[model samples]
Target chain A: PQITLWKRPLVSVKVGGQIKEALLATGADDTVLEEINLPGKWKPKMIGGIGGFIKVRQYDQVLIEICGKKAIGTVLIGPTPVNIIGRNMLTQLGCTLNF
Target chain B: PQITLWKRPLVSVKVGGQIKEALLATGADDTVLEEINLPGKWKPKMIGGIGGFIKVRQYDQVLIEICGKKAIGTVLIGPTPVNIIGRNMLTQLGCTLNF
Candidate 1:
C-alpha cells in the first residue's frame, strides 16, 4: 500500500479490541502506545524521543492491525504524548520508504 | 527509489559542508539536527516526542542533501537525542511512505 507524507501518516489501529489512530514513525524502532491495558507479560523499557527517554511497559505477544494487516509483536504502553506505530510493525504491513 | 524499513533508515546527509547520518522520520513534520553552526535566520521552535517537547533553533533557507537529493527549507538545530530527517525535506526528495 502507498501512503502519503504530505501530512502525518496516521492510520487506524486495532489493539485489544479498541480502535485508535497511530502515527507511522519510520524513525522509531518500536511501537509506543498511549496507556492501554492489554493482557501480556510486561517488562520495563525506555523509549527515546527528540527530547529525552520515557519509561514504558513493554508487552509481548500483542496483536495490532493496520489497514487489515495484522502484526503480533511487542507494544510499549506509557504516558506517550501520542500513539506511534514504528518500523517493527510497519514492516509487517509491508511498509517501506518510497520515493 | 525504494528504501527498506527493516532497520532504522539512516542516510548520509550533507549540511554546511559536513556529512552526518540522519534517521529518516515519517512521523516528524520538520527536520532537526544536533547543534550545527549553520548560517541562516533562526527562530525559536518546539518539537514533541514520546516524552516531551524540546526547544530548538529553527533556521530557514537551510540546504540539506540526502541520497543525492537536495532539500532547502527550515532546519531545526538543538540538543537533539539524534539527528532526524523529517517529512518537510523527505517530500522534497520525492519520498513517500510505502507498504
Candidate 2:
C-alpha cells in the first residue's frame, strides 16, 4: 500500500480484540494507544514528545493487526489524543517511507 | 529514496539559509521547527499534541528544502525537542508511505 501525506496516514488497526483507527507516526519510537486493556502485566514508563514527558503503561508482546498485516511488539497504554503506530510496530509490518 | 522503519526517518532540511536535521513525521499536520529565524511577520498560535496545546509562532510562505526537493509552506517555531517535517510540507515535497 502506498499512502500519501496529503491526508493523515491513518489505517485500521486491530488490537485488544477491537478495530480502531491509528496514525502511522514515523516520529514516534513507541506505539502509544488509548484504553485497550490487554490481558498482561504492564510496567510504568514515560515517553517524551513535543511538549513534555508523558507517563504510560507499557505492555509487552502485544499482538496488533494493521491493514491486514499482523505484528507483535511493545504497546503503551495511556491518555493520547490519537493512537500512534510507531516504528516499533511499523518495522514489524515492513512499512517504509518513500519519496 | 525509500526509508525503512527500522530506524528514525531523519533528513536534512534547508531553510533560512541553513541546513538542519528534522524528522519526517506523518502524524504531524503542521511543520514545527526550532531556532530558524526568517525575516517576516509571524502570528502567535497553538497546536495540539500528545500532552497538551503548544504555543508557537506561525511563519507563513516559508521556503524549505527537504532531501533536495523544494517546498514552500507555513512553518511553526517553538520549543520543540526535535524538528518535525509534517504533512503540510511533506505533501508539497511529494512524500509517500509504502509497504
Candidate 3:
C-alpha cells in the first residue's frame, strides 16, 4: 500500500488554566512527554518507527493538557517516525479515535 | 528572531468506542475538517501563514473527539503555518488553548 500521512488528534497546552500551543509533530509515540523544555543534547532512546526502530534525541519537555487530562513526557524533537500517538498512551487513558 | 517549530495540542478520536489513530498534525487551524479522505484536487483557500498568508488545499474532514467535545472541520492539508490550532472555532465552543 502507498504510504499515508497520519493525522493525530490535536489539542492545546496549558499552564495553570491557560491555553497555548507549543506542541506539534509530523508523528509521535505516546511515550513522548511534551512537558519540559530541554536541550537537544539530552539522552536518547530507542523508539519504534513505522517499519522499524530508530533512535531519537531528546530536546524539550512540555506540560500538555489534552482531553481533560494532563501529562508530562520527554519531547522527541523534530518530525516523528509516525504521525499519531500510538496505543502506548491511549491504552493508558482508555481513549479512542474516530476515522 | 530564529524560527522555531510549533506543536499543537493532542487528542484522541472515537468513531463509536473504537480507539484508533489516523489523526496527527504539526499544527492546524480550527477550520480544518479532517474527516473525509478527499484528494488534493479540492479547492484551495488563502490561509494565514506564520509570517504571511498562503494557499492550502482541502483534503480531509476529520471527526474529532477532544476534551470531551466533538467537532467536524476541513483538514488544512500538510504542514500548517502555525503548529497549534488557532482560535477560530474555540470561541464557538468557548474553549481555550493551554500553555
> Which is the leading candidate under lDDT?
2
lDDT per residue for candidate 2 within B1-99, as digits (tens), equals 788988889899999998989999999899998877788799999986535788899999999997678999999988777899999998888888877
lDDT of each: 0.85, 0.89, 0.41
Worst 10 residues of 1 chain A by lDDT: A46-55
Candidate 2 global lDDT: 0.89
Q: List-wise, what DockQ does each model earn?
A: 0.77, 0.82, 0.08
Identify the superior model by DockQ, candidate 1 or candidate 2: 2
Instruction: Give all candidate RMSDs, comma-separated.
Output: 2.7, 2.3, 12.7
Docking class of 3: incorrect
Tell me how far the alpha carbon of residue B82 in candidate 1 is from the true structure, in angstroms, after superposition.
1.2
- Candidate that scores best on TM-score: 2
lDDT of 3 by residue, A7-46 (tens): 3234454533455443333223444433334434676666
Q: Per-residue CA lDDT of candidate 2, range A19-74, in tens?
A: 88999999889999998878868999998643577899999999999777899999
TM-score ranking, high to low:
2, 1, 3
Off by over 4 Å in 1: A48-55, B48-55
What's the fnat for candidate 2, on a 0 to 1 scale? 0.95
Pairs in steric clash, model 2: none
True contacts kept of each: 0.91, 0.95, 0.12
